[PDB]
């Protein structure tokens, strides 16, 4: 039970079920001892002559041509039978029947922004060191010596044109996620009133731990551990 309580989306902290007593009805007696003079009079008469209706169950628990001809005594017994008698009669008919059956220019600005991109191929290859620079007297070849790569903002074959607020975005990926695809799939839907329906807004904003505001929280008890 500890695992399902850890995995449950919502814990409603009246969690041990309160022992609900039988409701105060107006169809019965909420004390089961005679409470008025009328009640004790009626019960002493009714215990002089009891009316638990076991006799009135066995009297009406007795009743082809029984189906066709008896269309008057059937209605008479239907009017005559009491509550549990009619329940048993319905059960007997149910069991009997169930036993019976079964734009050319636009390219210059595009070309300029391509040039202000794409890995920024600088060369400071060596200005004059080692090899007698300046005023004639050429050196040897392989003046390759410095082609370092300051990284452009986007590489040339990874745009889509070929086919102050870095404090409003988080520094790294936070703990429970493993990549920013997962984490932004968490952030992708707004829980606001303006963007969801009312039912979806309520489902999105109800908290996990929901306690009652003025009653004691008892420790958990399980069905035999």
């Amino acid at each position: 039970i500890v695992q399902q309580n850890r995995r449950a989306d919502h814990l409603i902290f009246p969690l041990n079920k309160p022992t609900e007593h039988n409701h105060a009805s107006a169809f019965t007696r909420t004390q089961d001892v005679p409470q008025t003079e009328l009640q004790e009079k009626v019960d002493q008469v009714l215990q002089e002559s009891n009316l638990a209706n076991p006799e009135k169950d066995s009297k009406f628990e007795e009743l082809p041509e029984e189906m066709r001809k008896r269309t008057t005594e059937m209605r008479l017994m239907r009017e005559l039978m009491f509550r549990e008698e009619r329940k048993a009669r319905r059960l007997k008919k149910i069991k009997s029947k169930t036993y019976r059956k079964i734009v050319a220019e636009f390219q210059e600005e595009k070309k300029r922004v391509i040039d202000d991109e794409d890995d920024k191929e600088v060369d400071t290859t060596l200005p004059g060191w080692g090899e007698w620079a300046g005023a004639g007297s050429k050196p040897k070849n392989k003046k390759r010596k410095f082609i370092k790569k300051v990284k452009g903002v986007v590489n040339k074959d990874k745009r889509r044109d070929k086919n102050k607020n870095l404090k409003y975005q988080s520094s790294a990926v936070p703990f429970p996620f493993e990549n920013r695809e997962q984490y932004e799939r968490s952030l992708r839907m707004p829980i606001g009133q303006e963007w969801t329906s009312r039912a979806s807004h309520q489902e999105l904003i109800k908290p996990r731990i929901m306690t009652k505001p003025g009653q004691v929280i008892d420790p958990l008890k399980a069905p035999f551990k």
Binding site: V103, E105, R160, A172, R185
Partner: protein, 458 residues
């Protein structure tokens, strides 16, 4: 669960170009279930939408739609809409720049000479009529009918509800274009100087001064989606600006010559720019493709506007011409002026009107109604354009029936949730994410001569 209109309510996400954790796996599964449930239940609200959009449909092949007259519309529609189609004949001061409040309740007109009037155009209640005898250029409301900013001879002034002057801005030296950013509380200003200035109306503080570096600002529009400003220069260049970067976010080569007007869709997807080379151009904003290039207009389009339901209202002097479904990708949505032999694949005008006396100053659709308010040389005229307004507003964004108490509390609440000016990016969904540096996988600190061969050993 299927919901034929979900992709309006869908939400894009990051992709890489599954997990072994049990708790994280079930957390992501709950998140995907909640996203699907939320999209479905949010898209089921289109049953609850009260009203239906307007239209007009030809019902014959002899009955073209651009040759339907405004008097014929006013006879065919109800008395409330016919009374909304107002007309003020204000002859003596100059051409009237029109402006509506963001719910369509108040109208703000400015004469070129001096006459600025803020009014409730649909009752008969004006609440400011002030004659500022120097040449005014433009005005806008700020967050209400209660304050408006006017761009005067040089300085931009800010007036209260009844017209008393609240502020004279010593910066904003020569404005010709003002626009308010309502979620950010920013008055944006551009004009004859090559400078773009963002001014916080709530605190009172000039947020940004940006060198356009391209001379005077010929046109100016605001993306309602992400609050970046599209300015049109005398190069034929639109540039998209934010108050964080001192350089434009993007520079597009829209037209030849200068750029006469810019309009943006409210979905932030399409932009229509008219140049002075008689060229209307429809642009994709998100992917920066050029969708349509209507070249050789008969006379240069002096204005464009885009309604809330995507109509395109171009104005070329005396003429106003509206196209329906022109902001779409296909070449059959290129706005034509006639259909050569009855081609169904040619976007002829949805409706047209001729202001025979004059030359129109500016265009503006009335926000939640089916009207187009055009301000011209002799005042104001609303046009009943039936396809041209969101029939189902949201009444807790901005409400056309809002009361005085609702205005007060909504003013305090939007003032409280004012977005900072640094959150303005080219896409709005980029302030929850991680850096585009700072590697996409989180790190777990664990990851944090046979003689010479003999002479070797020497």
């Amino acid at each position: 669960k299927e919901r034929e209109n979900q992709n309006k309510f869908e939400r894009s996400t990051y992709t890489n170009n599954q997990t072994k954790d049990k708790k994280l796996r079930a957390g992501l599964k709950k998140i995907d279930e909640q996203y699907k449930k939320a999209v479905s239940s949010a898209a089921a609200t289109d049953y609850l939408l009260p009203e239906s959009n307007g239209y007009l449909e030809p019902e014959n092949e002899l009955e073209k739609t651009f040759k339907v007259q405004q008097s014929e519309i006013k006879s065919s529609v109800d008395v409330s809409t016919a009374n909304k189609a107002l007309d003020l004949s204000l002859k003596e001061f100059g051409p009237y720049h029109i402006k509506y409040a963001k719910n369509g309740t108040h109208l703000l007109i400015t004469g070129r000479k001096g006459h600025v009037a803020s009014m409730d155009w649909r009752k008969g209640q004006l609440r400011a009529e002030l004659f500022l005898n120097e040449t005014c250029h433009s005005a806008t409301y700020l967050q209400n009918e209660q304050y408006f900013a006017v761009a005067q001879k040089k300085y931009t002034f800010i007036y209260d509800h009844e017209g008393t002057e609240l502020h004279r801005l010593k910066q904003h030296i020569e404005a010709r274009h003002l626009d308010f950013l309502p979620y950010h509380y920013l008055l944006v200003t551009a004009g004859e100087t090559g400078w773009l200035k963002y001014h916080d109306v709530s605190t009172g503080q000039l947020v940004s001064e940006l060198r356009t570096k391209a001379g005077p600002t010929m046109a100016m529009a605001q993306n309602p989606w992400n609050a970046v400003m599209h300015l049109g220069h005398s190069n034929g260049t639109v540039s998209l600006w934010s108050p964080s970067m001192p350089e434009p976010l993007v520079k597009l080569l829209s037209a030849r010559g200068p750029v006469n007007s810019i309009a943006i869709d409210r979905s932030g997807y399409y932009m229509a720019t008219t140049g002075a080379d008689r060229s209307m151009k429809i642009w994709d904003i998100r992917n920066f493709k050029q969708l349509h290039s209507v070249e050789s207009l008969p006379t240069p389009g002096t204005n464009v506007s885009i309604s809330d339901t995507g109509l395109l209202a171009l104005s070329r002097g005396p003429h106003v011409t509206l196209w329906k479904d022109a902001l779409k990708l296909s070449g059959d949505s290129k706005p034509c002026f006639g259909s050569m032999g009855g081609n169904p694949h040619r976007n002829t005008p949805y409706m047209s009107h001729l202001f025979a006396g004059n030359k129109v100053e500016n265009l503006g659709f009335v926000p939640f109604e089916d009207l187009l308010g055009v301000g011209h040389q002799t005042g104001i005229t609303n046009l009943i354009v039936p396809g041209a307004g969101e029939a189902n507003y949201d009444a807790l964004e901005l409400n056309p029936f809002e009361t005085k108490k609702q205005r007060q509390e909504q003013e305090v609440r939007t003032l409280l949730n004012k977005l900072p000016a640094d959150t303005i990016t080219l896409d709005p969904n980029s302030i929850g994410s991680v850096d585009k540096r700072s590697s996409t996988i989180r790190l777990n600190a664990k990851d944090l001569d046979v003689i010479e061969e003999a002479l070797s050993r020497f």
